[PDB]
Amino acid sequence: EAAIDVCSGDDVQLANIDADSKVINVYVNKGADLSKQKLEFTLPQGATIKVNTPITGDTESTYDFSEEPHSRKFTVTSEDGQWQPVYTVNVILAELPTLFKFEELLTTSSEYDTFYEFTPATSQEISKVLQWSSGNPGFKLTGMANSRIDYPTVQVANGFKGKAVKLETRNTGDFGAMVKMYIAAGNLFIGTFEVENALTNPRKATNFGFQFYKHPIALKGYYKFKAGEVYSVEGQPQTGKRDKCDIYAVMYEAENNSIMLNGDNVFNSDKLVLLARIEPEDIVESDEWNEFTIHFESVKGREIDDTKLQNGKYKLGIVLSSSVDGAYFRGAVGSTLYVDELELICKE
Amino acid sequence: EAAIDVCSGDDVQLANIDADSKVINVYVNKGADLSKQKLEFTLPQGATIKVNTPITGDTESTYDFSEEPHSRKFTVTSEDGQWQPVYTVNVILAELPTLFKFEELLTTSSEYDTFYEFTPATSQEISKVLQWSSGNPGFKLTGMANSRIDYPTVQVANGFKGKAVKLETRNTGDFGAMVKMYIAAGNLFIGTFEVENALTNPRKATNFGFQFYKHPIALKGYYKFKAGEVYSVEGQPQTGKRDKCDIYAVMYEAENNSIMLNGDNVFNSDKLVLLARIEPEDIVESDEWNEFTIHFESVKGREIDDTKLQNGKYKLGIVLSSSVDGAYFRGAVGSTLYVDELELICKE
Ligand SMILES: [Cl-]
Ligand SMILES: [Cl-]
């Protein structure tokens, strides 16, 4: 009859729904406009939802949560018409994490894995939260997967410390071949996946970056990589080249908060300030985990302006991929990159 | 009558003398010319020393240890003339460390502390060794110290993990004032101290850097700092300025292995490639240990050439000081900087 099954939103990294107390805790990245929050509620069929006290700051597509304690009540009325449970929605500010462990999955996402990072706030610092994105919602559309384990991006149990992320380049079948999307690289990235572009503009579907308030120096982690056996270009097998995985991170200037880089301009936009990237020559294929440390280097002499950093003008992105040229459909089905325990080393 | 009490040398980071077996293990930094080793032996009064088998590679002031196992025998004959113990001298290649813990002191240096770092070799890597330098041999000349604890550079027991280094700016007395060397900053650095310049050219006395074969990204550590009460310039008290400590590291190109930077050109030489340095604004005065992380930044767009790095053309230096402008005699007697557990984060 009436309830809130899922809560999403433009700036929502994570939304915890406590069905017992009817409390929804929504974590958003610092910098989000609290006065203009766009939220999306998934309710049972025929049920309606309405904010209890509308306020002037509200618009027809957003809610104003700017006033402390950034908490608003909502009533869900059944189609049935008889049940009207009241939910409290609390918006909580968070920052991107420093450590990424790949231990947690969204319990709402059952068809494929969706990873998130979370560290509770303390007296010293606010909540550290991130919902990682991938190409999984696009891969779903291929009809190729049977369950979560067939996807290009999957959580595995025997990580370096706890669980880890497994990225595997997958075969997209005949239809994939027809639309020239011959392979599906496994990826994990900070930003958003626009599924309405997944097939029409796969590189535009991957948007990278969230507001970051620290100065990054290095990205450190552990990985294992094994290349697939058959390297292909435009769907056809090629000899003489072995596939390689990819790990990189970016810091770029976003004049206004709506600006994001994507798969088509991440390495060519003049907004890019810092870039850390694993050297192809340094990648090994081993059954043992290897530690890597990469350096956030200045792009064309650009540097981080502290005042701009403080005002949220820079966005950080981290991208992991099983096939370095996979976004262009060059790579080998079966290339598998496992990553675990990433650490962002920042100026301190 | 006859023995080897101390063994030193131009390229000798550390020399262990095992009096029981009469074995001297000399660790030198990778890059040293094994065919031209200059060694200095301290023997009892009147005793003489001579290499057992001279070889063609020998010169009148150096020894050739290039041939494996880089081991030569030496006989020490007493003035007494009756005792001739034979010592075996083994030269061992080492690299600069990654971790600096300030736990060990040279047992030969009793008047003032001389710190060294040591990690034994393994199947994976060679010995990691460094003898740290300081201004202590110069301070000795002031007559101001009673024992090791009065020096500007001293090991203290209650470090962050084990023992730590305590750098304290000291008063140089009336003679110091006469020669315009009004204060003595406590320092610790990678390189060499030329005591014959200690008074005549104190900045030239501090030579920085040893051959380093990795790409440094960041220097990380723990510190506590407390400024002295009276800030002075040219021996005279000044109000309106509080003293600050300093921590920095450099990577510079050395065309030939004899090139070193010093106190007069470390921040102006065109050989400088990378510089990491703590921001004055980021230093706090606290009774609690604080972690710092500084970034090796490109100087004037310069970058590390891998082939040159591999051939030992770059030297790394790390410098710690209780008074940032202490080399120019601006600072406060009593400024105290404790450092512990430094870690060099490198590309991997
Ligand atoms: Cl969840
Ligand atoms: Cl010793």
Q: Got the DSSP string for A106-141?
A: -SS--SS--EEEEE---SS--EEEEE-B-SHHHHHT
Could you tell me where the beta strands, DSSP code E, fall in B82-230? 86-95, 99-100, 104-105, 115-119, 127-131, 153-156, 164-168, 170-171, 183-184, 187-189, 191-193, 206-208, 210-211, 216-226
Q: What is the resolution of this structure in A?
A: 2.1
Closest in A217, A291, A301 to B295, CB measured: A217
Reading the block at residue B239, the tokens are 């109000």
A86-to-A50, A74, A89 alpha-carbon distances in Å: 10, 6, 10
d(CA B294, CA B247): 9
Contacts of B269 (CB under 8 A, 6+ apart): B252, B261
**How many whole angstroms separate alpha carbon B147 and alpha carbon B138?**
14
* Cα(A104) to centroid(ligand 1), Å: 8
Nearest by CB: A347 against B215, B293, B298: B293
User: What residue of A is the nearest CA neighbor of B215?
Assistant: A295
Structural domains of chain A sorted by starting position, each given as residue range(s) with its CATH number in brackets: 1-93 (2.60.40.2340), 94-348 (2.60.120.890)
Partner B, chain A 142-181, Cβ-Cβ below 8 Å: none
Experimental technique, in short, is X-ray
Whether chain A has a CB inside 8 Å of the CB on B247: the answer is: no
Residues of A in contact with B294 (CB under 8 A): 347
What residues have a C-beta under 5 A from ligand 2, the ion?
A: B 106-107
Instruction: Please check whether residue A125 touches B, CB under 8 A.
Output: no
The bound ligand whose nearest atom lies closest to the alpha carbon of B7 is 2
Residue of B nearest to A347 (CA): B293
Q: DSSP assignment, residue A37?
A: B
Given CB atoms, is A310 within the 8 Å cutoff of chain B? Answer: no
CA distance B203 to B328: 9
Q: CB A347 to CB B291 under 8 A?
A: no
What sign results for the dihedral spanned by CA atoms A174, A180, A182, A185?
negative
Query: CB under 8 Å to A191, separation ≥6 — which residues?
Result: A133, A206, A207, A208, A209, A210, A260, A317
Nearest ligand for residue A113 CA = 1
Residue A310's Cβ-side half-sphere holds a number of Cα atoms within 13 Å equal to 3
Helix (H) or strand (E) run with residue A202 in it: helix A202-205
Q: Which residues does chain B break after (C to N > 2.5 Å)?
A: none
Q: What is the DSSP string of A229-269?
A: S-EEETTEEESS-----EEEEEEEE-SSTT--EETTTTTT-
User: Cis omega (within 30 of 0) on the bond before B54?
Assistant: no
Nearest-CB residue to A348 (from B217, B293, B301):
B293
**Do the Cβ atoms of A252 and A268 come closer than 8 Å?**
no
**Residues of B with CB below 8 A from A294's CB?**
347
